[PDB]
């Protein structure tokens with residue numbers, strides 16, 4: 001849980017954005033062995049960036065579930081004047097990258113297994129009153145061809161005790177009330193989950209949510225005019241189309257997640273049971 005900087009050895013850069021993640025080996029016996037881990041760092045520790053990184057760490061440390069990336073600890077580097085987060089290393093990277101690269105390692109059985117696993121991770125988040133706010137396949141990590149886990153808790157908020165929403169952008173995954181009122185909730189996570197289910201069945205092909213919504217809106221639109229047209233389109237029932245080859249019953253689940261009426265969206269528990277019944281009945 002506390003990792004010494006002198007024993008954390010660099011293996012590979014894994015991603016860069018606010019921060020970056022590297023693969024490292026933790027080798028305290030200095031003999032070229034040790035566990036392989038993923039290390040997240042800031043790229044600026046301001047009063048605010050660091051408070052928020054600390055909150056992200058506390059959030060991840062508080063979670064223990066099969067479909068959530070495992071917290072391992074922190075490293076206080078630069079002679080204890082910097083902070084890095086230590087997580088397990090998942091070899092196949094983001095689900096967005098994995099689907100696009102390994103397009104037939106993957107069939108609909110695997111897609112519905114990943115869908116189930118994401119729903120169960122989100123059920124677990126709900127028990128802690130955590131709203132993820134950035135559910136997308138870029139933020140889901142692949143352990144192996146049968147197991148994915150939710151990552152990136154950088155945007156996650158904790159519901160106040162007496163409220164069912166938090167008022168606070170990946171606009172093409174946002175629910176309409178998040179666009180118009182900055183309101184996030186379990187129900188807006190279910191809206192974003194419907195977009196993740198759409199991303200899975202497009203296999204990450206010109207079919208991405210930004211590409212398809214910009215085609216609907218007008219490809220030439222720029223700046224706030226995009227947001228104005230995306231809000232007006234969503235409020236009057238404009239939706240992403242059914243992906244090629246997607247079963248109607250899986251499109252129905254996306255459609256029900258994308259309800260403008262916040263209280264009529266299904267829960268993650270409803271979704272996991274429905275998806276697993278679909279899996280078990282085929």
Ligand SMILES: Cc1ccc(Cl)cc1-c1c(C(N)=O)cc(-c2ccnc(Nc3ccc(N4CCN(C)CC4)cc3)n2)n1C
Nearest residue numbers: 014015016017019020021038088089090091092093094152
């Ligand atoms: C995915 C990602 C993109 C950009 C940035 Cl800044 C960070 C991350 C990220 C996060 C995160 N968002 O907190 C967590 C991780 C993470 C955690 C545990 N394991 C891994 N494994 C992993 C990550 C990426 C890969 N790649 C596989 C394909 N090549 C093209 C790119 C890198 C392979 C393995 N990543 N990553 C890479």
